[PDB]
Each structure stands twice: as structure tokens, then as C-alpha cells.
Design a protein around this nucleic acid. Sequence first.
RNA 1: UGGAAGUCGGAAUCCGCUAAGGACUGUGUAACAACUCACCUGCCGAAUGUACUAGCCCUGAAAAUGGAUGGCGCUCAAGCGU
Lengths: 109, 190, 305, 245, 158, 65, 79, 103, 42, 135
Amino acid sequence: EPNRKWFTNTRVISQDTLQSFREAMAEKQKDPYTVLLKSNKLPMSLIRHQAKMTIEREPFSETFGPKAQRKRPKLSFNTVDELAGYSEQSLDSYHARLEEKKLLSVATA
Amino acid sequence: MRYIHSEETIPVPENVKVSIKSRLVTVEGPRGKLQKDLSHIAVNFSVVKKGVIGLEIHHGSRKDVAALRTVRTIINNMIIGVTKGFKYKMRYVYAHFPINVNVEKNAETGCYEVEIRNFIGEKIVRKVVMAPGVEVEISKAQKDELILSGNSLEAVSQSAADIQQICKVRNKDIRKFLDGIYVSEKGNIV
Amino acid sequence: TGWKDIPPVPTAQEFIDIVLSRTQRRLPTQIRPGFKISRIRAFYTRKVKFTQETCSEKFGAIISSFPVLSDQHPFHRDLMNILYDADHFKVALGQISTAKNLIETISRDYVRLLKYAQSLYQCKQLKRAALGRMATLIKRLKDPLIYLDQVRQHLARLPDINPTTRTLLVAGFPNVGKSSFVRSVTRADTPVEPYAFTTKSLFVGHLDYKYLRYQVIDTPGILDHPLEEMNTIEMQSVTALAHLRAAVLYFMDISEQCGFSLKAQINLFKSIKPLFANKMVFIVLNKMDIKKFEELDPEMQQEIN
Amino acid sequence: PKSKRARVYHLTQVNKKGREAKERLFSNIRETIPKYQHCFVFSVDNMRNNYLKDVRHELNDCRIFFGKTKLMARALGTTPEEEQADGLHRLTRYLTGTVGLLFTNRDPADIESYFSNLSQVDFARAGTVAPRTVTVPPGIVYSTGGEVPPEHDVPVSHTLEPELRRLGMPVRMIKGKVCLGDEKGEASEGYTICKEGEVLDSRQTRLLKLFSICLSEFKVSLLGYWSSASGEVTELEAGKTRPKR
Amino acid sequence: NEIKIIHLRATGGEVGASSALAPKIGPLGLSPKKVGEDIAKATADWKGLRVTVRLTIQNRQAQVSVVPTASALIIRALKEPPRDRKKEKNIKHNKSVSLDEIIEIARTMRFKSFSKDLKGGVKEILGTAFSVGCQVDGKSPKAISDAIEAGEIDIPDE
Amino acid sequence: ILSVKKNPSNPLYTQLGVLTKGTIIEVNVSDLGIVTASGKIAWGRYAQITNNPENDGCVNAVLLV
Amino acid sequence: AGTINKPKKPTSKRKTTRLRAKISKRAAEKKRKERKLARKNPEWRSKLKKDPGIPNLFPYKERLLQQIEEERIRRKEEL
Amino acid sequence: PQNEYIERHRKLHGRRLDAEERARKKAAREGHKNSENAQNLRGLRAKLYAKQRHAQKIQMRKAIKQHEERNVEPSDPIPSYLLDRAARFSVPIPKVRGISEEE
Amino acid sequence: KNLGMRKNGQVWLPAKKAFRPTKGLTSWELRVKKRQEQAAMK
Amino acid sequence: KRGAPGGKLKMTLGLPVGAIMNCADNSGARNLYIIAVKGAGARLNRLPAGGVGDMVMATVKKGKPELRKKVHPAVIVRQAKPWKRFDGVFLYFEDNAGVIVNPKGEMKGSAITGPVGKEAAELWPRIASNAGVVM
RNA sequence: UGGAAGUCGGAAUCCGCUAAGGACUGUGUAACAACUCACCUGCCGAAUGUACUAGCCCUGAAAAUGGAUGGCGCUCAAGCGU
Ligand SMILES: Nc1nc2c(ncn2[C@@H]2O[C@H](COP(=O)(O)OP(=O)(O)OP(=O)(O)O)[C@@H](O)[C@H]2O)c(=O)[nH]1
Ligand SMILES: [Mg+2]
């Protein structure tokens, strides 16, 4: 049956009350030996993109392919000296990781 | 719709003899004589003018009218075969293994035979038996070329297609392997 | 040892067609309303599980075959960073993995619902819902699939450079005879044409010296400008010079028929010499049928000294 | 009639002209008549007709029409009852085949002298007679096909080799070079494109155009001219020989 | 003694246009640095503009000449303030050029235009200016061309 | 979902909280920024289920604004 | 398809009595449901019907237009 | 091999001698093949083929329409701030099918 | 001889004519008169 | 290659799946337990079996402990089931024994104790090189 | 843009000579070149083109022993409409 109360807000709360409730409830979660009383009647519902940006700025078609317009690579170095340092530390990290994996006929099931 | 009368005309040169008997056309000229049985198509032949063959269909449909163009082109091709002849020049190219082509005349069957060897290094010997009337010659003017000559366009072109289709590269990239025999030129002997 | 073993990556529509084709043709398709409801549930559950298994197998085949940038040599990692946007590469493969995991979650949820479905119509609607959600998830991958197919073909055509072996590295300006040198000393088929930037990708050939196998790497030419202005074609050469412990042969044309000045070539050499630490540098002066060192000006000879 | 040829719709900017182009031609021809003293009829038969732009530029004070022959005849007026000016129906008898109109105010002697000494070497069309024998030598095929010495010729482009094979030359691709026979010019004879005193067909003329060999000439022949003052048509030399309708 | 004519596109006040020339002028016996200095001296009064340059080669020397192009003349007549190519890009030519300067450019291009009249040359220059994207007399060059057809704007004869 | 307000078929179905077509549910609309005239956050609002969840595997609803 | 050398199971055109009765019942119910939807349909229906007109290939279409002319002229004169 | 080696192979050696002729003849026979597919495919393959052909016909018709006119709203006038806007307090679905207790 | 080329390469093929089985059923001038009458009618 | 020797004449297969044979080399294993043979066909209820010179998959049950965690390819060199050669000789060895090799046939061990079969020596040249007695 | 000349991209897409020709439809070049399409002219000779509508026909989804317009069989019917 049509009724006016279908199109009204059913639960409302103010800014300061919501903030105080959240702060007090967070302080209650800080203690694991303190539990609520009548938790079923409490408003617990109130308590409880880099990839997208890169794809938006540069599409896959403009990156690589027959219609690609990409011409300038994205680098982590600026001049030749930091390029040499980057290569040196990259080789050192690669060798260290390989030694770590080495330290860490098929096998039986 | 059934068209009451439809007609086609074939001009005949002076050196051609055409004999039609129960839709069996026999065309004889300077180079030779050909025969073809066209009894599977309902058509009436007549002599409309001197040196002119008339083909007519009565009370036929559009398909029956359109078949006269095929009959006209077939008889014209027979006339062109007995007057000027037909010649297909084919070229066989290779990348690494030289393709060896031998031509001989099997006299017992009265027909030419072509043997193809070393096609991409294969040890098998491919053999193509010509239709009778088709003569095979290894061309001396150009390099790696066969010449197929005859009076029957169907026989010469079918022999050429057999030579193309017996040399096919299998299980390889056709962009990379371009070996084979291909029909380079089609034309008349005279 | 090459990346030719990557299976071909279809488009979104081709992927949907393939998965639904195996689902249609590799499973029985006749079920009757007069059968037992457990039998109907088993039928549609098998359909959903088979579709998920096909999708997961294909997605795992795509992910497990593409190279992992963190586990490559720094030369290969930075070379793939030059050729392909490494961010875009990782985003595409992460979206593939995300779609795989979401397809698995959708399949598990709809199998759980098919456990409680009570009629053949409800089971059919649940199966169609699961398959439509999987098709929508695949359709949201139109661009990464095309990108990964192009990357796969380029990786399959990429040469094999061993980062730690006896290796010569030819570098310099365009039109100085690098490709002619590599053709003369190796069996590699690198084009030699008078225009600049004829070589657009790294070529590698091989030779033998004292019964030892050497690899020789021909690189695209490098121009004289700061590193921020360098495009990908020259940055392939810059990556090869930076990350490969090689014998660098810097080729110079003193005749200046390459279109560049000797001062510019010397300036580029002095700019890239920090990368030449712990590497063996040989300046090879080419084209002496045109002009020679003694025919050069004394100040240029002094600067080269 | 289900079995029919699929009529291809063209996704290009330029459309069919139609009747409006004919009406525009009628208006232009019927408006250039009362401004020029003489109207010449010229003929260019079996010619490429691409130097008419240079002729139009050189004769800036003249007006040249090269539309449809029947359209130009009906524009000038075929019968004396419909002619725009007196004597134009006499001029319309020369408009057959590939002809054109030249409205001018210059001296007819000057026009005849200009179209006499005007001559540019041009590619031959099908139906012309070959003035000489042209043969591409065996070996590496060059751009001119042996017209210039081979030491001063660039090799022919590799993309033209399928076109030469389709046009009948048995060339082949060796090491990126289009070669006739072998690389060193052996095991084959030269390819004779045309023989002297032989009617050229489209295949031979296209081969000569690809090899940049010109075996014809561009001659504009004046048939006659109508004068506004005298109201009469004076017939020139080529007009007697050329058929009239 | 043979005379060879080579047409090229170059930026004025630049040397690197001869980088592409040295593949072909090198076999001809020319000095690429000398050719670059010559084209820089010839195009010193076309700074920052793409300008067609003709090189005439005979007896192993080349003389440089500037072949005018309508787009370059319109861009120069726009009087765009001096700038460097490498730092800022994607620029637009949206300044104004006067109709008198357009007619002067057409008079410069009477040797290239095949039009019967200076009005036809002026309209060609207006079409080129419309392609460039500038404005003439504060209005659209297409609008001025349509006004020239309509007849209220009169182009002087020759 | 905060509560099931009315299942139109049977009050027992509402007591059991059954989500079918035409069911009024109460949803937390805190993520939509619906605010009262003075600044109070409207965090509970009715909505109607407009699909068949037992055949679709999901609950689709329309706000009663 | 390898149908000539190895035909598959034939499709029977011999109708089943149960199938025919069910199809007849379903057809009657479809006719009834279409009647109900036609009665409850809110889609607009023009009272006037669009005239198909006179074919162009009729050779006396001119003449028909003439007696239409003096028919309407005589009607206007009489009115 | 390395890089665009098939393209380099085509540059140095060309393609097959009948490749252009075979491609042209295949493009010519495409109409016959399409009609044979429309009149001879069976079952689900035929249904998918028919649906895809309907899709291409719709797309081609729209493309032809767009090339044809390359060269060429509520009732009551309301201002810009009243656009895209729309008693009885009824729900969107006031009546649904009742569910029996066996269901 | 034939001064042109054929695309398929069948140089022996004759200069075919248009397949018009309804040829000769009417004349050109009569068709022009009918065209004028249909234009006035429309 | 799936370790299937070519050119092997048919003989009696005396070692089915589940058999335990001696480990004849010095790789450190004392016995081998057969879990599959290479080149076995598909047949209902039939246990795969192998003879002398056949490559099998085996697990180490007695021996050095780091051999007990993997599945090794092995070649059977001796069997106790009598088999016939092409010269009409029916023969059998004192015990069932094999050697651990790689998938390519190269031996992991360095020497062989006791004789090896003619068929094994024929189909595996490394066993013929590391064998002392060939029977 | 390293190179981009109608034909890797973004935005515009005008004028002249016109009989007609898009700041271009594809092939092609590193870029050019070259070929081709749209459009026009010459030869020819009289009817065509587009989209719909109504009939019959093909497809428009099928499992599992060997079979069914009732069966043979029927093709200007022994099928379909009057
Ligand atoms: N006279 C002479 N000309 C040379 C010599 N070496 C190379 N050239 C010419 O210089 C041009 C340089 O072409 P490449 O050999 O490809 O040099 P490059 O373009 O820098 O090499 P890439 O960057 O790998 O493409 C060639 O076309 C040769 O014609 C030489 O030693 N003497
Ligand atoms: Mg180069």
C-alpha cells in the first residue's frame, strides 16, 4: 500500500554525535577484555587507483602497437651518473636476490 | 517468365570446319580437330548466315537463356584452339634446392610425362601425366620455364593446374618458403 | 633463452567464444525436468565449474609464461622498460590476475547457490547468471589482451642477449658503419642503408675467436642531447651501454659524412664515458677511404689524443 | 533475382556530378560566346591530354573548354534555328570524338603559330605504332630499362616486381634486387617490350610508362574557327582530313 | 658540369638540417658543414620557420636559395614573438594578418599560382591561411574568401 | 542492509528477513551524502528490491527517494 | 558434411497424437492471450487507414486523374 | 631470427608468385562462400553466424547513413535549471507474485 | 587485336554483351515519350 | 625424448610395477622400487612391466637418504625371469637389478658391480662404457 | 615526430585550373617515389540501379537399438494455391 513513510529518512545522526561515538567505540576496541552490552541494539553499521590513473592518462593502444604514439620512456634516473649508480645497485640487488634464492629428477608426490 | 525465343551467334573463320550432329560439335582447323558433346543442354543449332552459327532456345527460362553464353564461349574456345592454339608458360623457382624437371613422351600411352625431383630436398619423384594433345617443352629462351601447348584449352589449363598442385609446401610458413611451380603467362601459340 | 614459448593471447570476444565453445562441446547438454533435482544441480554445477576451470587454465597460462620483470637481469628488465611501458605491462598482467580471481570467486558463489536451487528453471538462471558475469569480466579486458598479444609477438621476435658472456657492443652516431662492421664480422642480417636510424632495434650476431664464442651487439645510433630528450630507439643503445659489461666499440666518422660534427661526436663520447667505468673502450675511426687521421686538422687530432 | 552483384558504396567525399554539371557547362559555354572574337575547334586524339593545364596557363587571355563532345555541340547549337550566334552551327560539324573549344580574341595566325610550334614528348597510348624497338637488357633491371647507361641509373624499386610479373616480364627478386635472369646477366635473353612497326597494347604502354620511356608526342591539331565579325567558319588543314558529323 | 637541383625542408637559423643531406651530398663531394653554414646563412631571416630551400650543385659546389612557401609567408606575416622549439610545443597560430599583407603574399606567389587573376591568388592565400588557422582582418579567412566571391571586397588587378 | 522492513507475501517472511522481489529493505546511505536540513547525516533509508535474487545471485534495489 | 555416404538418424515427420493435442491447446491459449493483450494494449491505433494509392504502371492514370478533376469540380459547383 | 625478419624476407625475396592472384580470387569468391555458409551451416554455428551477419549489416547500414548526412527534447520550453527533472506515495513495484509456503 | 587487358587474364575471352533477355520489346523514342508522360503524371 | 629405446626386440617382461630390484651402481642406493615403466601401452587392468634394457621410474627405499626423496629414471640391467634372444638362447640372471641414470641415459654412478645384460649394453652406450661384464 | 611529403597520429578540411580530381580510398617507402580508388573524358549501344513487399525454397540446434507424410514411392509430382 502507498505510504508517506517509505520516502523519509529512517535513521539520522549528527556530526559531533557520530564523531564521539566513533572515538569511544575505537577506544573500546583498543581493550580486548571489554565487550559491549546489548550490541544488537547498537548502531554498529556506522563503525564498520594508480593503475586506473595511468591507464586513463596513457591508453594501451597509445603505448605499444601499430597505432602507438609513445616516444619517451619513463625512467628512474636523470643523468649519466645516476644511471651508472642505478645499474650498479640493480646488479648488486639482483646478485643478492639470486644468492638468497640459491640458499633457499622430480620430487615424490 | 519464359522467353519465347533467345539467340546467340558465333562467327566462324574461313579455315574452320564445324560439324554438329545430335549436339556433338566437331571443329577441325589447321592445327587439328576437337570434339565436344553438348547434349546435356537443350539448344537448337542452325546456319543463320554463311560462316555464322546460330544457337537458339525456345520457351526457356532465364537459366536456359543464360546457358547459351557458356555454349557460345565453349565453341568459340574450340575454334580459337584449332586456329591459334593455346600456350601456358610456367616458371619454377627455388630457394636452396634446385628443382629438377624432366620431360619425356610415354609413347605407349602416347602422352607426355613430367618428372619433378629435388623439390625442397625431398627424395620422392613427383610424376604428372599430361592429358592427350598437350605438348611440354623446356624453354631455352628463358630460365627454369616449361611451355604447355595444345588445341584444347581445358586440357592445357588442367595440366598446368596439376603441375601447380603437385608441388605444394606442407607444414611450413608460406611467407618464408616460396618454392613451387607457377603459371606465369597464358596466351595463344600463334 | 628466448620468450617464443608464450602461448598466443586472443582478444576478449575470441576468449569468450573459445571458453563457451569448450563449455558447449566438451560437456553434455541435454537435461530434462523429469530428472532428479540433484542430477539437475550436478549438471549445472559441472557447467559452471568447467567454465571456471577453462578460464583459470587460460589465465594461468598467460601469467605463468610472460616474463617477471623483478626476476630478470637488470639489462633485460630495463630493456623491456624501454620497449614497453613497464607500468602498463604490470597493470595488464595484474588485471589478468584480478579477472582470474574474480572469475573463481563468482564460480564458487554460484556453485554454492546451485547447491540450494530447487528447480531446473532456477538452476538454468543461476548458470546463465554465472556465465554472463564471467563474459562481462572477460569483456572488460579488451585493451590488455591486445596489448599483451603485441608484447608477446615482439618478445618472440626479440633477440637473445646473454648478459654475462664474451660480448662486444658497437655504439656511436648514426651512419658511421656500425651495421657494416657487424655484417663483416658476424653472420647477422642487419640492414645497411645510407639514411639515419636504419637500425631501430638491437641486433646480435656471433663470431669465434681462439675457439671461444663471442656475441656482438649492434645498437641503434645515439644523438647528442640530454638524457631527458632521448627517445626509446636511442635508449635501447643507452640501456645496452649501461647494463652490459661488454667491450664497447665507439665508432666515429671523421669524414663527417654521417651528418654530425666531430665536436658533437666527441661531446657524446664525453657525456657517455661515466657508463664506461669497468668497461673496455675502443674508439674505432671508420671510413678511411674518404678521409684519414693525418688528413684531419691538427687540433682535432690533438683533441682525439 | 537473388544472385546479383553487390554494388559497392563508396566512402569518398567526391560524388557523381549529374545533370547540374551539364547545365553549368551549358551556361559557361553560352556565356563565353559574346566575349571572344574567334572560336577555334581543336583535336587531341589518342593522347594523354595532361598538358592541357599548361596550355590553359600559357593562354591566360583565352578560354578552353574540354567537356563532352555532344554537350559542347548542343551548347554551341547544332541547327541554325537554335544557334547562339550566326555561323556556330557550321562550326558544330567538326565536333566529333575527342575535341575542344578555344574562345579567343587574339590573332588566328598567332594561335595557329603557337599550336604549330607547341610540342611536348609524351607517353604512348594503346593503338599507337611503336617508332622503335625497346628491349630491357638481361641482368639487373633499372628504372629506365636501359634508356640511360646502367652506371647512371638507380635500380628499379622492389615493390614493382609483382607488377612487372603481372605485365609479363619474367623478372625475379634476388637479394632485394629485381633481376631479369640472374644477378650477373646470364642464362636469359633480353625482354623485348615492343618491336618497331607494331601496334602497342595497354600492357606494352604500361610497361613503357613504368620504365619512363616516351614513344609518342602531344600535338594539338586545329580544325577550324568561327569568327564573330564575319559570321563564318574558316576551315584549316586538319579539318579536311578529320571526319565530320 | 652537370647541374643538380635538390629541394629540402629546413628550419631557419639551424645547422642540423644537413644531417639528412650528408647521406646523399657526401657522394656528390660536398662538405656537409659548409652546406649547413650556407643554409643557415640563407635562412637566417626565416628564424624558427619550416622553409623550402633549393640547393644547386655544379662542379662540386652548391649555392643555396630560399623557395617561398605560402604557409611560411603567412606565419612570418603573423609576427609571432620569438621562441625556442625544444621547450614549448603544440603551439597555435591564432594571431592576425592584414588583407594588404595577404595581397602582397599573393603577389609574391604569382610565379607559383596558376590562377588567372590576382583575386584568385589572394583566395588561394586565404585558403592557406585558413588551413594554418590564423585570422585575417579580425575575421575568418573563409569568410573573407566568401565575401570576395560576393563582391563587396574588391581585389586590385595586378 | 540494515533490516528487512516488509516482505509483501507474508509477515512471517518479513520476520525471517527474506529478500525477494518487491521487498522493502533498509540500507545504510552514509556513502551517498544524504543530509538533513541542519547537518545531520541521514544514514538509514528504505529501498525496494527490483530483481529476483533467487534466480540472479545478487540483490538489486532502487532507493525510495 | 558426409551425409551421402553416411546419413544420420532420420527426423520423423509422423506426428504424435499427444504432441498434436498439446500443440492445439497451446495454440488456443496463445490466441486467447493475444486477445487479452490486444484488449489491454495501450499502443496508439489510427482510425483512418493509409491509402495504398494508384500504381504508376497503370497506363490510364492520367485519365483517372481527369475524371477525378471534373468530379470534384462538379461537386464543388453543386455544393 | 630477430626483429621484423618476415618483413625483411619479403623485402629481400618477395612473396609467392601466385599470392596476389590467389588473394584476388579468394576475395572474389567470398560472396559465394558467404551465401553458401548462410544456406548450409547447421545448428548453433548457423545461429551464431546469422547473429554476427545481422550485426555487420546494422553497422554497415549505420556507416552508410553517417556518410550520407556527413553534410547536413521535451514539449514545454523550460529553462536550463529545470531540465532533466521529473501526491501518490507509491513504491516503484506496488505488486509482485505471491510466494506459497512450499516455494 | 584486343588493345586492352582482362583482369582474370583470359585473353581469349570475347567482348561479351549485356545479358538483356527483354531486348527489342520496345523502341527508344517510345520510351522517351513514356518518360515525358510519367514525368507530367507524377 | 621420453626415454623409449628404439630397436629393442621383444622379450619377456619380468618386472611389473611394484617390483623391488637391486641398485647395481655406486650412486648410494641399495634397492629400487618400480612405480612405472617408460613406453607402457594402455590396457585395462594390466600392470606395466619392463625387461632388460627398459627404462623405468623408481624410488629408493634403502640407500643414502637424499636419494629417497626423488623419483629416478633407471635402466634394468639384470632380470631373473628367463627370456629368449634371437639366437634361440633362453637365459636368466641371478637377480633383478638396475642402475639409476638421467633422462638422456648417462649414469649417475661411476661403476657397475656385477654383469649387465646384452640388451641394456646395446641400448645404452654409457652402461656399455661403465660395465665390466657383458652377458 | 628520429623520420611522417593525402595514406603511424590530433584538429581543421579552403581555393584555383577545371571535363574532373578528397588537404584523399587502399597497396607501398625509413621518408620520397610508384600504383590505385572517388570523379571526368573517349569507344560501345538501350535499358538499368537502390530499398522494400508478397509466394515457394535453404538455414534458423541435434543426441544416443534400426524406421517411418501409414508403406512403397513420387520431381511440367503421386508436392504447393485456386
Ligand atoms: N666510404 C665508406 N663508406 C662507408 C664505410 N662504412 C660504411 N659506409 C657507408 O656509410 C653508411 C652507414 O651505414 P651503416 O653501416 O648502417 O651505419 P649505421 O647506419 O650507423 O648503422 P646502424 O645504426 O646500425 O643502422 C653505409 O650505407 C655505407 O654506405 C666505409 O668504411 N667507407
Ligand atoms: Mg644508416
